Ligand binder design. Structure first.
Ligand SMILES: *C(=O)CCCCCCCCCCCCC
Ligand SMILES: *C(=O)CCCCCCCCCCCCC
Lengths: 745, 72, 41, 41
């Protein structure tokens, strides 16, 4: 309203910028030609001629002013008809893209810990300490360590968690009785390692941590105690005993490091009062140290549990000793083998996951998998029906970052008005973009409408908040379907009820021929994809009609099967009772359906899923959506009766969190504490994986009870095969008939 | 090479599409009028079916359409 | 038939239009475009 | 398939040849050449 020099200059700048001098209305010296078909009504005299250009593009109407966006507004991408050719839709991007784009990382992990107790004294099975899962080779390496470290810093900040975590557990080993007290009220406590004094100390003396009594006095030690003498747990200590001797010192280049640990535990399991609780912390529980420990202190204490509190990706585990009595017998059990094995099984998962992330302070290149790539245009003229560069670059960009975000901004320089349009290019886009045969256009109307200045772009690998427990589960199948569809022999696959916009195209090898279907119309211009490879069918699969002429050797009903039973207002068992047989007829060898049945427990989640028992039904977010369910057993036999020869199996979000390259891989924060929620939300809704191509199992107990010998029978013609049953993403039973190593019993 | 008559076809084909111009804009599909001069080029050399006979057709700045273009 | 205005040079409900076949100009387009191998080249 | 060498720019048993139909280029020489009286002139 009140033009300011900064503004006038930003207009006189925009005017000077090379462009096309409007040509609709030619200039006169005594007359202003005004469009007849225009709001302007000529005054009177001889100064206004009603000249009409041959084709004026403007129509009339106004525009209500909208205030400046406080933050970069994301823009859902809706496609147009014309599509640019990969070649042209590439340089178009590379002519206006911000290539070596500097980007902030933020924090990918913000949640608590994902603690996991393990009773070593608990398991009654002896397990040769010589043959445990020894530290994996790669572990100590420039590449692996680099990542193990990178991940560490990518965690918004840790002992406050870890330490507290160990005490949350240590509070369970407390025996109040006189018969044999353990951490009995006012027990003395030794503590080694402090930075001022550990924050947990305040709490122990406060009795703050529920379950654990308030200790009489706490005696600190370590290398920087600042309140107690400085001891070196490697060698001998000149102090007295304590009920609880919580040791948390670090070990760090492997053999002497083992000696360091074996020694430290030796003196920590020395400072404990007879019948106390030593809590050492090993850094590398190698099957080299697990022989020395179970040999030297094979007596020293009564119980023993590994308490690995995964705050960040490291293999340092905590060990607690039961009763510091001289004649104990802490034998290495199969528990240890499993515990230890689960640990590593996760570092491969957590490492493989972090590979998708760039190293801090490195200019963004095209190399980084999670790199944020944008396209800054200057006063871009996004036009519909024209392949003008500004609108041509818009194509590529959105094509290079579809399943992601795509945030567009407009900062007003006192010169022109730049408009970057970034997005988190991940590996989930590289998979999708590859399947694209052409780069479709985007309805630039929404962009042309804006006309308001937003805040400057940010370019940050991760968003700020931890994804919803529901997403931790969903991105737990996008990794599962990804690994299943990656199988060669799979051939042609269809998706019963893909999203309005095929979200499965990213989770499939760019070569497999898939055909997503949904009642609503597909969001992506189905034309840009090669017809032979990708097909799209509209209308629901719930209706008998839809199944005419649709033959795929494998179907996947993930995220839909539950909504169909609810939509068609039908019983869950009865629904799949009509769907499975259709997939059989559709010519299907494999099946994957995100059915929602309580196979683990009928127990529910307080805020995520309510299990109404009067009527078999769920309540995701209590109300937001209600979908009927089935029972593990009834639904199990109903499907076995449908496909008698087919082999069934339940895949569910495995605690190894190996699916991670889908949450940390796309650039989303999370809570290491929620992994537990989702591994419990995944149990409420497993993915029943059928396979008509093989003989099904035979369990003699049927509703198999824990701790009872059961008969399982795999019908394979060749005796020369290797049986390897694995639960939780960790193998537990492996070996040809003769020898079978079993950690499950 | 795009001999005189073979341009008659691709022009006659595109001509029948340009006709529908008013319906392409109305419905935001299309992408502007398709000029056949967007798929060709102005190279020059000898144009025949085989080195031997192509030697007798020296054409200068003829109008050829490259394979990848003959695709679009 | 609601008025448009510029999208296309003619309004349908526009002033003085006129449906009127003439045996002279049999309406339109181009269907028989030749593309057969020998004839397209 | 015995090696030739120059008669023609390609050996049949030559290195890295490749039979591979593409729905895109339907193989065709020139059969429908028009020669009928009116059309040839
Ligand atoms: C407004 O749309 C009222 C309906 C008048 C025309 C609708 C279509 C019928 C006439 C066709 C005109 C164009 C060629 C038939
Ligand atoms: C040597 O002549 C061994 C035979 C190999 C080719 C003989 C003819 C069969 C293949 C035809 C190639 C040319 C077009 C069919």
């Amino acid at each position: 309203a009140i033009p300011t020099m900064s503004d006038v200059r930003s207009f006189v700048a925009r005017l000077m910028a090379e462009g096309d001098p409007q040509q609709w209305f030619p200039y006169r010296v005594d007359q202003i030609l005004y469009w007849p078909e225009s709001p302007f009504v000529p005054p009177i005299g001889p100064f206004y001629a009603p000249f009409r250009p041959v084709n004026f593009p403007f129509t009339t109407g106004s525009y209500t002013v909208v205030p400046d966006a406080s933050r970069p507004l994301r823009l859902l991408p809706q496609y147009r008809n014309a599509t640019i050719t990969v070649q042209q839709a590439d340089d178009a991007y590379e002519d206006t893209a911000l290539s070596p784009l500097i980007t902030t990382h933020g924090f990918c992990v913000t949640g608590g810990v994902f603690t996991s107790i393990y009773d070593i004294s608990g398991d009654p099975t002896a397990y040769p300490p010589a043959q445990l899962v020894d530290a994996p080779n790669d572990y100590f390496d420039r590449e692996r360590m680099a990542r193990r470290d990178l991940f560490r810093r990518l965690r918004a900040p840790r002992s406050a968690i870890k330490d507290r975590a160990v005490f949350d557990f240590l509070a369970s080993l407390v025996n109040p009785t006189t018969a044999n007290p353990v951490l009995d009220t006012s027990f003395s406590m030794a503590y080694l390692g402090a930075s001022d004094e550990p924050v947990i100390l305040a709490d122990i003396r406060s009795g703050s941590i529920p379950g654990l009594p308030i200790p009489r006095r706490i005696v600190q030690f370590g290398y920087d105690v600042v309140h107690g003498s400085l001891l070196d747990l490697s060698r001998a200590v000149p102090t007295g005993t304590f009920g609880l001797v919580y040791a948390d010192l670090d070990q760090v280049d492997m053999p002497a490091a083992n000696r360091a640990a074996i020694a430290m535990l030796g003196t920590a399991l020395q400072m404990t009062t007879a019948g106390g609780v030593s809590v050492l912390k090993v850094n590398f529980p190698t099957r080299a140290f697990w022989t020395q420990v179970f040999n030297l202190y094979a007596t020293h204490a009564t119980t023993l549990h590994l308490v690995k509190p995964t705050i960040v990706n490291s293999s340092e585990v905590f060990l607690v000793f039961g009763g510091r009595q001289s004649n104990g017998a802490l034998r290495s059990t199969t528990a240890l083998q499993r515990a230890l094995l689960s640990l590593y099984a996760r570092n491969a998962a957590i490492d493989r996951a972090v590979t998708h992330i760039p190293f801090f302070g490195v200019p963004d290149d095209g190399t980084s998998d999670l790199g944020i790539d944008a396209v800054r245009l200057f006063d871009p003229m996004f036009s519909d029906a024209v392949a003008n560069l500004p609108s041509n670059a818009l194509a590529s960009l959105v094509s290079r970052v579809v399943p992601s975000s795509i945030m567009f901004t407009r900062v007003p320089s006192n010169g022109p008005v730049s408009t970057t349009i970034y997005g988190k290019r991940t590996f989930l886009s590289n998979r999708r973009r590859a399947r694209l045969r052409d780069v479709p256009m985007l309805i630039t109307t929404t962009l042309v409408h804006q006309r308001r200045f937003t805040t400057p772009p940010t370019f940050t690998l991760f968003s700020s908040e931890a994804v919803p427990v529901t997403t931790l589960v969903a991105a737990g199948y996008n990794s599962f379907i990804s690994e299943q569809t990656r199988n060669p022999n799979l051939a042609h696959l269809l998706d019963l009820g893909t999203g309005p916009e095929c979200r499965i195209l990213s989770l499939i090898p760019p070569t497999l021929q898939v055909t997503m279907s949904d009642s609503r119309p597909c969001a992506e211009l189905m034309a840009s994809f090669d017809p032979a490879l990708t097909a799209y069918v509209q209308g629901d699969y719930s209706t008998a009609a839809f199944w005419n002429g649709i033959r795929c050797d494998s179907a996947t009903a993930i995220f839909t099967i539950g909504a169909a039973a609810a939509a068609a207002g039908t019983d869950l068992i009865a629904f799949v009772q009509q769907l499975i047989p259709r997939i059989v007829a559709a010519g299907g060898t494999r099946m994957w359906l995100q059915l929602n049945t309580p196979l683990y427990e009928v127990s529910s989640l307080p805020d995520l899923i309510e299990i109404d028992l009067r009527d078999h039904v769920y309540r995701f977010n209590g109300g937001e959506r209600v979908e009927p369910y089935a029972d593990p057993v009834p639904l199990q036999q109903a499907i076995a009766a449908l496909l008698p020869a087919a082999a069934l199996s339940w895949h569910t979000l495995s605690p190894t969190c190996d699916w991670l390259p889908y949450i940390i891989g796309v650039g989303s924060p999370l809570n290491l504490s929620d992994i537990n929620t989702a591994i419990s939300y995944s149990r409420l809704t497993p993915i029943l994986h059928i396979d008509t191509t093989t003989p099904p199992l035979r369990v003699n107990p049927v509703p198999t009870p824990l701790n009872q010998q059961c008969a399982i029978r795999i019908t394979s013609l060749d005796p020369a095969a290797v049986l390897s049953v694995q639960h939780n993403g960790v193998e537990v039973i492996g070996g040809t008939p003769g020898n079978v190593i079993s950690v499950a019993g | 090479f795009v001999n005189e008559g073979m341009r008659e076809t691709f022009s006659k084909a595109l001509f029948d599409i340009n006709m529908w111009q008013p319906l392409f804009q109305a419905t935001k599909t299309g992408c502007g009028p398709i000029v056949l001069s967007s798929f060709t080029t102005t190279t020059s050399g000898y144009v025949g079916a085989t080195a031997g006979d192509a030697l007798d057709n020296p054409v200068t700045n003829g109008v050829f359409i490259s394979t990848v273009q003959i695709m679009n | 038939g609601n008025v448009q205005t510029s999208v296309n040079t003619y309004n349908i409900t526009g002033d003085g239009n006129s449906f009127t076949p003439t045996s002279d100009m049999t309406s339109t387009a181009a269907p028989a475009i030749d593309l057969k191998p020998g004839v397209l080249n």
